[PDB]
Symmetry: D2
Subunit: 186 residues, 4 copies
């Protein structure tokens, strides 16, 4: 395995399709809305294992459009235990509430999906695990993609980091690019 | 989707190919050595969302032979943070230490991969989420599977549960069947 | 017990002395920098047990000045695993980066300790556990406190919530009061 | 601080009383039934911080008799989310089910309390954190106590470990001593 893939439990396309890699090359974690929560033991131990033990040099976080987890985060109904998991997504919503407010209602979900990926790569790059790997000169790249379920194509996004400094630049640029609106507003 | 599939992060077969089902039918969680740890918020919330919100009626836990997670748990090297995750597998090894001891060292892993699946289904069945769904008459079945690629085959790992009664029985029975040695 | 007290692991005053209540009244959780992290199974299950089983009607979150956890979160050294826990505090610093920037460096910590308490009460109030108790008319109040031992005093840190309405209002107001600088 | 204290959220006696130490010497974690769950980020990060950063040389896990968490684990009602936390206690019950079965019903709780502490010290000593500290020759002792709420006195138990080898011996001996029954059976 040369790639750690963090995808959503909704996503129906296996990482094999979205990476074009042969089975065997992918180590895969899947959770609701493809999160890297700072203190999630499950995902963190996967990342530490991939980076420190398997010496994987690429981590891909992949979100997707029409994501039930994102939709569920936004609908904010009393879904039970999962609501607590999705509160990290609502924090990201409100961190970007002015931006999201400028979009037409039916465009906001897919913007949140893209913002989410950027935020999760930013979290991943700040883990003790990735920061330490970078500090000691280990080769490690982080990638944040979004897959369009409608037209079955990727969108590389451009969140790519190979060090703590490019993490800052890449994260900032991604949010700046997301803030430039097309025909999503009236 | 109609199925929740809980599988391993180092598994090399997609759930869609194992199940031979539509891309659409499977809601998927993957973690190291396909665990349902009692207090893991990640897996538990997947389960709660699947059972209570998506109204899924089948949960599959799928292990596999030649599992790097099971092997790591057994090697017990200083791997770092991941060792803490895998201590749950070491607890499983010790629980079945007598059985696993009376077996050739090169065969222990694959026995442990199967025992592990039975233990995780038993854990799944004891979650507040699943207990309470069974208590209120909700239709819900748990399946423990192991796949092997020396060739290409499966085994509904003797573990099938539709209630807490059938969970005790199926769990104990699955352990007893595994205890008969080739 | 009638109170759940959530405080800091490096706090040097017992909850019983702060509250001046009986040994018996306080159910107690302590973690580093007194956090209510959305997905922390440890704190959340304490909260659920306290609210749903013990039928406790008051939750206090208590921060303190000269907090080693807040200081660690700010120093951002390579401390190891603990840094991951404290990233939630760094997220809080960034959220209030403009406010904290227009303040003397030796005063930032104590401002951040207070902001932190307001943020954790807001988190507590947004748990499925507390939301749902408020929705079904259950009597339940949340209090954010900071104590200071330059001398010995408290402050119900402007944060008091008995509903989701009063949570938004009290949260925003607590932030606004903290934003007026001495 | 020279002591990390892991106690129960029930316990009403502050660690100051049970250790006789001055305020300032104790770093304290409290959770339901004083557990060290292998993958609990909260408690593990506390332990890693105490051991690696604060250079604390003593960790005390303290349970107590008449523990609501233990009682709640045993009653096995549908309490909700907390049931999942307490499932680690029921695993310990069934790991020792033959022993517990020989006791009179009204003696079983306080035996589970003692067994629990032993099991939690054993977990603590197996963390990557404590095992590594020991491996590199760091001075670190683990202590498992139980406080009797009825007669306001401690019971040191004798779970004490200063290395991985004494962890095995101490844990085994503790369970062996717990298995020798007084007048708790008929
Ligand atoms: Zn999704
Ligand atoms: Zn595997
Ligand atoms: Zn503190
Ligand atoms: Zn207790």
């Amino acid at each position: 395995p040369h790639y750690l893939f963090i995808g959503c439990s909704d996503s129906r396309v296996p990482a094999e399709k979205l990476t074009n890699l042969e089975p065997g090359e992918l180590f895969v974690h899947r959770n609701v809305a493809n999160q890297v929560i700072h203190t999630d033991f499950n995902c963190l131990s996967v990342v530490q294992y991939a980076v420190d033990v398997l010496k994987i040099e690429h981590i891909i976080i992949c979100g997707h459009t029409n994501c039930g987890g994102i939709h569920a985060a936004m609908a904010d109904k009393d879904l039970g235990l999962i609501n607590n998991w999705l509160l990290h997504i609502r924090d990201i919503w409100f961190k970007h509430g002015h931006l999201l407010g400028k979009l037409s209602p039916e465009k906001r979900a897919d913007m949140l999906t893209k913002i989410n990926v950027a935020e999760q790569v930013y979290n991943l790059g700040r883990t003790s695990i990735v920061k330490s790997a970078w500090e000691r000169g280990q080769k490690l790249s982080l990638h944040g993609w979004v897959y369009d379920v409608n037209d079955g194509f990727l969108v590389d996004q451009g969140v790519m980091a190979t060090s703590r400094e490019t993490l800052e630049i890449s994260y900032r640029n991604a949010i700046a690019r997301l803030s430039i609106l097309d025909e999503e507003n009236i």
